[PDB]
Design a protein around this ligand. Structure first.
Ligand SMILES: [Zn+2]
Length: 259
DNA sequence: GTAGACCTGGAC
DNA sequence: GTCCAGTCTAC
């Protein structure tokens, strides 16, 4: 999931857990726990704390408790669900938070790529992994000036630049490909080759795409122009969409609309 | 920048 | 059987 999907999770999960107190924490795949390194310490410190809020920073979810904050990244396939602690768990459930009212928050992740870090609230934003993140795209903090500053400094592809969470936080493979198509820019061109006009246009489309995706509850799949449409005609010019590899990942684009 | 890592299951 | 699907690492 990318920013739109994570934001949809944040909004829907909050009312299902706010106000509940943690009674136990069970871990079935220790590698997911990154800090504290010892999973026994990770579990023990959360017992007795109550959920007070849930925020999002980039692609991360930030569970706010009493003293601590739990920072969770779903990576490629992580997912959360709330259910009765009396029922059998679903396959691939690796971490479970048991509440005093008999319900529980379950974390599932088939590929086991997700991560979890716990810090005191005041230290969360000053320690990894949140410390080095770029600005939120839907905030005044993200502007053309900010994009140009990083752009006019590197020769790597513009797609590689957009996937860099230190530049701006929240974009993944789908929304980077969609934003570049809407702005009319080829994904493989050097970031330093973009003109000032191209930068302003890219910024504008990035904000519009991510904003619209949030409103639609994420993949919005019926509104995709290029992602996963290789071999199909472009919705704007009819030219077949193509797929290659850029920045080490699948890349979709229209050879006529993007230059 | 270009494959491999970490891991598992679906489509061809 | 073989290719495909968010970050970090080593040549
Ligand atoms: Zn086109």
């Amino acid at each position: 999931p990318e920013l739109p999907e994570v934001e949809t999770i944040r909004r829907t999960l909050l009312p299902l857990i706010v106000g509940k107190t943690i009674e136990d924490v069970r871990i079935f795949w220790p590698n997911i726990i990154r800090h504290p390194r010892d999973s026994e310490a990770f579990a023990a410190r959360m017992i007795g704390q109550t959920v007070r809020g849930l925020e999002r920073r980039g692609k991360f979810l930030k569970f706010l408790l009493d003293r601590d904050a739990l920072i969770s990244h779903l990576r490629m396939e992580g997912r959360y669900a709330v259910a009765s602690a009396l029922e059998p768990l679903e396959p691939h459930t690796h971490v479970v938070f048991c509440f005093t009212d008999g319900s529980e928050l379950r974390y599932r992740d088939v590929r086991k790529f997700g991560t979890m870090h716990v810090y005191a609230k005041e230290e969360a934003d000053r320690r990894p992994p949140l410390a080095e993140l770029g600005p939120e795209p839907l905030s005044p903090a993200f502007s053309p000036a900010v994009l140009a500053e990083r752009a006019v400094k590197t020769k790597r592809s513009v797609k590689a630049l957009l996937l860099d969470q230190t530049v701006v936080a929240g974009f993944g493979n789908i929304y980077v490909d969609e934003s570049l198509f809407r702005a009319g820019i080829l994904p493989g061109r050097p970031a330093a080759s973009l003109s000032s006009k191209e930068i302003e246009r890219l910024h504008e489309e990035m904000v519009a795409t991510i904003g619209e995706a949030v409103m639609k509850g994420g993949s919005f799949q019926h509104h995709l122009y290029v992602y996963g449409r290789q071999g199909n005609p472009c919705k704007r010019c009819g030219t077949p969409i193509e797929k290659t590899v850029v920045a080490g990942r699948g890349t979709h684009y229209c050879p006529r609309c993007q230059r």
